[PDB]
Subunit: 119 residues, 4 copies
Amino acid sequence: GITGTWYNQLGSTFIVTAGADGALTGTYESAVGNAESRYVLTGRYDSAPATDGSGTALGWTVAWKNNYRNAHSATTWSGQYVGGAEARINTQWLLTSGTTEANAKKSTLVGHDTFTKVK
Amino acid sequence: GITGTWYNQLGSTFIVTAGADGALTGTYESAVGNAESRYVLTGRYDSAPATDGSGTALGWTVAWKNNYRNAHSATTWSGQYVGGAEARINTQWLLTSGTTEANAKKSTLVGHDTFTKV
Amino acid sequence: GITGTWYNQLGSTFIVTAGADGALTGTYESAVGNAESRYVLTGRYDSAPATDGSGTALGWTVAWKNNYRNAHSATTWSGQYVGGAEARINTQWLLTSGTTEANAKKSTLVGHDTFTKVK
Amino acid sequence: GITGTWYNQLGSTFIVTAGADGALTGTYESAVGNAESRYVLTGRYDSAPATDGSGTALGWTVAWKNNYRNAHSATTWSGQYVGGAEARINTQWLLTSGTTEANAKKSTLVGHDTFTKVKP
Ligand SMILES: O=C(O)CCCC[C@@H]1SC[C@@H]2NC(=O)N[C@@H]21
Ligand SMILES: O=C(O)CCCC[C@@H]1SC[C@@H]2NC(=O)N[C@@H]21
Ligand SMILES: O=C(O)CCCC[C@@H]1SC[C@@H]2NC(=O)N[C@@H]21
Ligand SMILES: O=C(O)CCCC[C@@H]1SC[C@@H]2NC(=O)N[C@@H]21
């Protein structure tokens, strides 16, 4: 249920493949920020989730460097997949930018993204 | 550089290899929590970082399932590598557990880990 | 403005008064968790926000102890007030529980709440 | 245990009074960022913690406006006070800057501060 294309509330596109082993691989295209086109993403997910009515834990990372540009930053998403007729991946994220010591307070932004199979 | 064996303030062990094209692969062993032995990790890092003294951005994930146990959770670490005399990786992490929709509020813990090669 | 009765997506009720001095005072009643009835809250907000369309920064805290129960925990909400037709307060929160050294990992939960005066 | 002067690893100064009623009141002076001098802070803490080794839950907010300047931002610290030999207040914080809807992703920074009774 995780493999496929996902869309978040910002208009971004998350293309992922969930491996039989627990591997998450794919590309991410952000609708906002210092980003253009697709970026590599890699992550992990619980490949044997509880069959007791709970989501499937997972996470992935995107370093914002590709053949077109480098934002010198990286974002990690942490959350869970919930299946069904209204599938969704609910996440909280941390976007860290490389900084000088003097600027360490500005290194990490926090937010949340909800992904659905629609849009 | 990033490639090597690191330890955080809890005594956890982070063994990682930084690929030339931005990949991070390795193993993680936590000193605390619902975990035992090593777990697979994968991530990404800026392989062409700025040269103005700024750290190198990076991140990685561990899903807490291995051959011995499964905690039905996953942690992501977001941070940066800083070289020099006392090289370190400063991170903030999010640990999400699979939950019911009703328990979503208890789903994600937040913290911070600092790693050094010592 | 900020003064008023707000509700978030969980059904919790946030009753607040924004003082001319930048203070936030009021009560909070959570629809979920280890809580019952009203709890005291206090916080601060920018009483001279920018005039370029930016939101008004604010934050408040609730320690989860009142005359009826004590959860040995406290939550802080950080966010901004957005005026206009549909006024809203968008927040990210941290819920810290008192813990022993051994349970440090479980000390702080992070989430997000959106409030409106509707309900 | 809580009332008094605290310093974080950045050298910021947190002077607070914990009321018998759960109130936290005081001043905060940041060593970094768009700030100068002292700012008003208000917060709350558990006035009857578990006497079992557990810390004392608490939190406070500073809106970064005072008589000298206004950064149009506010920080909330969430954490717990731990007494004993080496007393500390361990916290995680969220700093939200007022932004337009278009700059939402850049609205909230996250970090951590460890406060001690002895300057860094
Ligand atoms: O600006 C940058 O440093 C690189 C792009 C960051 C895009 C962020 S990642 C968190 C959020 N979710 C998205 O889909 N886009 C933004
Ligand atoms: O309890 C669990 O669900 C799985 C183990 C979590 C270990 C956490 S990950 C964040 C922190 N850093 C560590 O090295 N260990 C803990
Ligand atoms: O369980 C507890 O420790 C005390 C109650 C916490 C209720 C949380 S605070 C963050 C979120 N928003 C709400 O309105 N309720 C929950
Ligand atoms: O730059 C600003 O918007 C206002 C000042 C922010 C100072 C931050 S609050 C979190 C961290 N802890 C400190 O003591 N100082 C910085």
